[PDB]
């Protein structure tokens, strides 16, 4: 856990930065280029004409906004990289970019807003014609403007501490010697400006490589990729032109282009076409004006990137980048220059889009949005639930008996834990809704306990009938009353939410029965009731001890610090590994969660110390207003999370203190849907009891049959011993085999009702029983045959590549663990923790390998994972011996 937040978003919230941008845009930037003075000491002499177009194209408001956003992103990534643990570079003060406080960040942004407002034309460097240096004069103008601004608004005492701070920032802005690495502010301004100006220098590929090499030592390799990707997105959002990056001349030119350091002018000369084989083989670089003679040749970009050492060291050797004119976001940059708000909003939009797209590309793409067809076991569970609804007399105080078969608390509990509740509830109907009230009538006297140990036990049936049960309401009104019962959290909701997630401890049989019965029906009511315009933000309250809160914060920080939107290479494999191992979205629950739009109600009424904020850009969540709005308040919503939708954190903010003095944290979660999150299913766990009931019914039919003029009797015996008895035996085997097709075949083999009616010697009781068996098996098995195949994760390529990358990574980590030789208690504890997390990673590998298995008739292999586990156990045995020695 770092001492500062992983997120810095000053531009979105801060007021002083926006005010400064508005002031500078209204005064200096939003005006045509005036042209430099012919004589600084004599204004009357006039001005030289501007060297380029009078419009502020290159150095307009767009440049300032992009540079400030890039500086903020640089601090973002520096903090992330410090959190991951890899060492960062140091400025000459010994400070690291992660160590700058937010106050210094605000000062840096304010002093960066004035970095370009002094210019008058596009001339650069020393001039031969007049022996002048326009750069120094322009930045002197900028320094004077900064001093005037800080004096005018009495800013000293408000942000800046004293005069020396203002003088330090003025010396930063003046840039007399290009002291590029004096202190973090120097770097954060200068290299940001260089990154932004990268787009104009040519050739583009060498400039990009040089900028990567500059950023690598300061922020890190992954940071040097992320910052460039973010700046490319800002370029496309604001509307600048970007030269084409083509480091291997795939477009088939005659040559890739001469190699040339754009800032310095270096060129590598070969003597007699002797192509080298490594960067070290290159002779020293000649200057820009060196001439070629005889049979000498300039080093070409293609040949330069054909070298192996450059290929290994610099990741961008193989990549190719999209040209701007191909997407043509042109030329609405001139339109963005008109107002700061447009460009600032676009910058914020791009910044959020990058973070969301990183995770979404890390996981598998959404194949379809339509919901799955039900699994055979879920259809069976829905039928079981409806059959229980049929009558409550069959319910006993410690077990459930139905159709001659008993059920334990274990069956209901693992049915809740394993199967979907949404589809099962959707399979039910309104007759079950009325049977709800019938059950409430039957179960009037049973007790119920809340999660508070001091709560008085209540009889749920009496409470329902008196308070919840509306006088003579229609079925929709009972659905709204069920939602209304969900509203009363204190006495009933806590027990349900604890039972449905195995958080329950000590509840008896009737409570778990009621939970597994009510959850699908309540969700059914929620889908059936109404449709409401869904808000795009939801706040959910929770109360947690600090011990759990610290682990939650650490998990969120790790997830945030590992997700990165790299440009050159793909780190999607690492994001997938880190999310699955550390995600906490299983705590968000699989029940009706009560949320609200208004943070004020949570902070005032409840005063909870943990708050979740859910974002739904895709509309994956489907929140519903709480039934009868006539009594239900506006700010009360219910949300049901499907299994293939998981929540991941992107922000962790310390907002304030509760009335008890406890720190209150506000998370932010982005909802992502992917087939990867569908849990593995132990299919057939609930089909077995259903098949047992069907077999019992068929056996009772056989019982009546063996309990049961001569021509009619002989024809009765013919029809029995030919059609039914063999068919009953066949369907008995089929149910024993749990084969629907064979049961259906025995069904077709069974005679028709009218054929039985022809045989008068068959008693009407047996005829009715046999026809009832036939119809019941038909209507129960035909839906049971539907959708017997679970939807398949068909993206084999992505899963295979991810598995290979993860396998390489875990093998490397196992080798690193093998290298370890401890010497004290602390090393032993660290090794134990590392072994534990590596074993968790191996479990992740096991799950991924199981998902990779597509054939039904082959066993899943764990030879590699078990080999690494054996190596780890050998190291675990060796470690105490080395420690003892």
TrEMBL record:
Domain SidE PDE: 26-242
Cystine bridges: 336-343
GO annotation (BP), single: protein deubiquitination
Keyword entries, A-Z: Coiled coil
GO terms of molecular function: NAD+-protein-arginine ADP-ribosyltransferase activity
Domain SidE mono-ADP-ribosyltransferase: 369-705
Compositional bias (Basic and acidic residues): 41-58
Region (Disordered): 32-59
UniProt-recorded name of the protein: SdeC
Organism of this sequence: Legionella pneumophila
Organism lineage: Bacteria, Pseudomonadati, Pseudomonadota, Gammaproteobacteria, Legionellales
Range within the parent protein: 229 to 1219 of 1538
């Amino acid at each position: 856990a770092p001492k500062h937040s992983l997120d810095s978003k000053l531009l979105e919230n801060d007021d002083d930065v926006l005010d400064t941008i508005k002031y500078v845009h209204k005064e200096y930037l939003g005006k045509p280029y005036p042209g430099p003075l012919k004589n600084p000491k004599a204004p009357e002499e006039g001005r030289l004409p501007p060297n380029e177009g009078p419009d502020r194209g290159p150095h307009g408001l767009a440049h300032t906004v992009r540079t400030m956003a890039c500086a903020e992103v640089m601090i973002e990534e520096a903090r992330k990289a410090q959190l991951r643990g890899e060492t960062l570079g140091k400025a000459k003060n010994g400070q690291t970019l992660a160590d700058v406080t937010p106050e210094e960040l605000k000062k840096i942004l304010i002093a960066q807003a004035f970095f370009v407002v002094g210019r008058d034309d596009e001339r650069s460097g020393y001039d031969d014609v007049h022996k002048r240096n326009f750069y120094a004069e322009y930045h002197e103008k900028s320094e004077q403007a900064f001093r005037k601004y800080v004096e005018d608004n009495k800013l000293i005492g408000k942000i800046f501490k004293d005069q020396k701070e203002v003088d330090f920032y003025a010396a930063i802005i003046l840039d007399k010697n290009h002291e590029w690495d004096a202190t973090p502010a120097h770097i954060l301004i200068n290299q940001g400006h260089m990154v932004d100006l990268m787009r104009t220098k040519a050739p583009a590929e060498v400039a990009l490589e040089r900028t990567y090499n500059t950023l690598k030592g300061t922020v890190g390799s992954k940071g040097a990729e992320v910052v460039l990707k973010a700046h490319r997105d800002f370029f496309f959002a604001t509307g600048a032109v970007v030269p084409l990056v083509n480091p291997e001349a795939i477009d088939d030119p005659s040559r890739g282009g001469p190699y040339e350091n754009p800032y310095s002018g270096e060129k590598f000369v070969i003597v007699d076409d002797k192509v080298p084989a490594s960067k070290k083989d290159l002779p020293k670089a000649v200057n820009r004006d060196y001439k070629l003679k005889d049979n000498e040749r300039f080093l070409t970009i293609k040949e330069y990137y054909a070298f192996p050492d450059v290929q290994q060291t610099y990741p961008g050797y193989k990549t190719r980048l999209e040209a701007s004119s191909y997407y043509f976001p042109t030329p609405f940059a001139g339109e963005c220059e008109q107002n700061p708000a447009k460009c600032l909003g676009a910058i914020q939009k791009a910044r959020s889009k990058l973070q969301t797209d990183a995770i979404k590309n890390g996981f598998q793409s959404s194949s379809e949005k339509e919901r799955r067809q039900p699994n055979m076991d879920e259809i069976a569970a829905a039928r079981i639930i409806q059959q229980i609804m049929a009558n409550p007399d069959c319910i006993h105080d410690d077990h459930v008996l139905i159709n001659g078969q008993k059920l334990e608390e274990k069956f209901f509990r693992d049915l809740l834990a394993k199967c979907d509740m949404a589809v099962v509830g959707s399979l039910l109907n309104d007759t079950d809704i009325k049977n709800i009230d019938t059950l409430m009538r039957h179960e009037k006297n049973t007790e119920f306990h809340s999660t508070d140990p001091k709560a008085v036990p209540v009889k749920i049936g009496d409470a329902w009938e008196n308070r919840i049960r509306t006088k003579g309401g229609d079925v929709t009104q009972m659905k709204h009353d069920l939602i209304f019962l969900m509203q009363n959290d204190a006495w009933y909701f806590s027990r349900v939410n604890a039972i449905a997630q195995n958080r329950d401890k000590g509840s008896n049989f009737k409570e778990v029965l009621f939970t597994t019965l009510m959850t699908p029906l309540t969700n059914k009511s929620l889908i059936d009731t109404s449709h409401v315009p869904a808000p795009k933000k939801l706040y959910r309250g929770l109360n947690l001890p600090q011990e759990f809160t610290n682990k939650l914060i650490n998990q969120s920080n790790a997830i945030i610090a590992n997700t990165e939107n790299t440009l050159f290479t793909d780190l999607s494999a690492e994001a997938f590994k880190q999310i699955k191992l550390n995600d906490f979205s299983q705590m968000s629950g699989k029940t009706c969660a009560s949320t609200t739009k208004n943070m004020k109600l949570l902070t005032d009424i409840w005063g909870s110390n943990v708050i979740f904020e859910m974002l739904d850009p895709d509309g994956l969540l489907h929140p519903k207003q709480v039934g009868t709005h006539m009594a239900g308040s506006e700010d009360e919503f219910s949300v049901y999370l499907p299994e293939d939708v998981a929540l991941v954190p992107t922000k962790v903010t310390l907002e304030g203190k509760t009335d008890t003095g406890e720190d209150r944290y506000i998370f932010t979660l982005v909802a992502v849907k992917s087939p990867d999150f569908i849990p593995r299913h132990e299919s057939g766990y609930a089909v077995e009891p259903f098949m047992k009931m069907q077999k019992e019914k068929v056996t009772q039919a056989l019982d009546a049959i063996e309990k049961d003029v001569l021509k009619q009797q002989i024809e009765k015996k013919i029809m029995l011993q030919t059609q039914i008895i063999p068919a009953l035996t066949e369907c008995g085997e089929a149910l024993d085999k749990q084969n629907v097709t064979e049961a259906l075949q025995a069904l077709n083999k069974l005679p028709a009702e009218k054929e039985i009616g022809k045989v008068k010697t068959i008693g009407q009781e047996l005829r009715g029983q046999i026809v009832g068996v036939k119809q019941e098996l038909t209507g129960n098995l035909e839906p049971l045959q539907r959708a017997t195949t679970t939807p398949i994760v068909q993206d084999a390529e992505k899963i295979k590549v991810r598995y290979e990358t993860l396998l390489t990574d875990v093998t490397k980590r196992v080798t690193d663990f093998e290298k370890i030789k401890p010497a004290n208690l602390d090393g032993y504890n660290k090794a134990i923790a590392d072994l534990n997390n590596i074993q968790q990673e191996l479990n992740l590998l096991r799950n991924e390998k199981i998902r990779m298995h597509t054939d039904k008739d082959k066993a899943v292999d764990f030879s590699d994972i078990e080999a690494l586990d054996k190596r780890l156990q050998d190291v675990q045995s060796k470690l105490p011996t080395q420690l003892l020695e």
